[PDB]
């Protein structure tokens, strides 16, 4: 799709057998989702850095469907005010900024 930016670019995703919504965020390096039970291995990771850090669980090579595009990438699971698809997964789906 071509998504204009008059509203927040919120898309539907499928992850961990769940349907969720997330924001396509070119300002975010990483993808951070709340409340997903993913199977397989993880390691803790500190993100943010303003006011302290936030600890999340880093799962590598997670299958995720974004707006119908099935890809694989690192998903950080932990507290976040909004589910965010970061550049790491936008590259996988071939998403570009165009003007």
**Residue ranges that bind a second copy, judged by CB under 8 A:** 1-6, 8-9, 23-29, 50-51, 67, 69, 81-82, 84, 87, 90-91, 93-99
Segment (H or E) for 32: strand 32-33
31 counts as binding ligand RSZ under rule CB under 6 A: no
Query: CB-wise, 12 or 70, nearer to ligand RSZ?
Result: 12
* CA–CA dist 27, 25 (Å, integer): 5
Q: In angstroms, rounded to a whole number, what is the distance separating the alpha carbons of residues 38 and 17?
A: 9
- Which residue do the tokens 């799709």 mark? 1
Q: Are 56 and 77 in contact (CB under 8 A)?
A: yes
40 binds, among ligand RSZ, a second copy, none (CB under 5 to 8 A by kind): none
Q: Which residues bind ligand RSZ (CB under 6 A)?
A: 25, 27-28, 30, 47-48, 50, 80-82, 84
């Amino acid at each position: 799709p071509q998504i204009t930016l008059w509203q927040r670019p919120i898309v539907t995703i499928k992850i961990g057998g769940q349907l969720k919504e997330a924001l396509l965020n070119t300002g975010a390096d990483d993808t951070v989702l709340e409340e997903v039970n993913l199977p397989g291995r993880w390691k803790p990771k500190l993100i943010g850095g303003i006011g302290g850090f936030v600890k999340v669980r880093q799962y590598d090579q997670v299958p995720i469907e974004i707006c119908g595009h099935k890809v694989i990438g690192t998903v950080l699971v932990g507290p976040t005010p909004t589910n965010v698809i970061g550049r790491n997964l936008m590259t996988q789906i071939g998403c570009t900024l165009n003007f």
